[PDB]
Amino acid sequence: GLSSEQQRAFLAVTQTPHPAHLITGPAGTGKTTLLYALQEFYKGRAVTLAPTGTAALQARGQTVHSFFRFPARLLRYRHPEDIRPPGPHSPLRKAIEQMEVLILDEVGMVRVDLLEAMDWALRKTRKRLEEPFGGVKVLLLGDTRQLEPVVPGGEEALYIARTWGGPFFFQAHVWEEVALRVHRLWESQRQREDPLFAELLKRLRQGDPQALETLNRAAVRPDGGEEPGTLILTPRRKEADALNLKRLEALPGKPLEYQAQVKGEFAETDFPTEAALTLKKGAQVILLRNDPLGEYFNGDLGWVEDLEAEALAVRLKRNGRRVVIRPFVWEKIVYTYDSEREEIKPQVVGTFRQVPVRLAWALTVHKAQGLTLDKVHLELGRGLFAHGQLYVALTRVRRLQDLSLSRPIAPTELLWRPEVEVFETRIQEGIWQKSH
């Protein structure tokens, strides 16, 4: 049931012994439905992983961290304390030893250390140290034009720069030992549903600011946020918070405040949600952690149904189901430099305990990455500031008419890091081999 373009990639991946493939293209191009066809072909032989919970859900797999039991921190290069093989008689060891294919969805969101940790974990567990991924055939799928992987400041950023030169999956050293065969998908849903939108976005992918004039002519209407069924996106947290606060205060009903418990050193700028979180029944929220039992994910939108002491009920938009939310603990990690060997090392210095809930009438563009919305309004505020931020904001909706802007987009807000441009020009040949 694949299109001709999808069948081309399906056959190029399944009917060759080559062990490393990348299937890439813009959103709506068929990557996920091709993944399902690959799963049906391989079924027992393949393990499906993704870097986020919502992507793992859409890929019918698990997160990379959960499968390999990686810690939620910087994965230092082949470091035995961050990358631990499974025990001698564990189910995970059997799963890795018998694995033939690893399917990795949304690979553009896989940070370089995550991918490298996969490589090392597979090599060590399978005892094939000289073969990339321990001889497992890796099928990467994803768009290469997204928000960059998260890289905190301080010694962590310096480590990643020193070790890999950057955060992207194509900067991993494993590509120096195996060639990545590339297969592009061009035909998108959007090309059929709104070709004008698809043409504008293609030019913006190419960094062409010319496209902004038509986009601004079509989409600028400052009152677009006042319309029903409209989620508001902002570049920064402060403006989204003010939006949410206004909606919360206008919502009739009795409020309940959830007070975080903070221990040790945890600056409030690093808080994953508000320390004093006030909620009302019916408030639009977004969940902030992945359920270990798979009933909800970080990024799930929903509505507050019940509010009680350290426990609330949320009705999920995704499936209409009810989930009960209790506090989670986040850790603050600091990396200290040893200054005599290379030797940075993590230490947990603080903890933050709070219900994993944030108000969601307004969201940041970063937080809305990976959601598909029916209608969005972009309240630009002081402006977009990150690689891919404009493109990700625009692509949250299916049609240009579903989008509105508070003001014209400026050419300074169309941002792409040159390393991503360089990698794209090299994967237009059909195969890519990282130098060194």
Add this chain to the structure above:
DNA sequence: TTTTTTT
């Protein structure tokens, strides 16, 4: 500056 993954 500026925001976000991962348990």
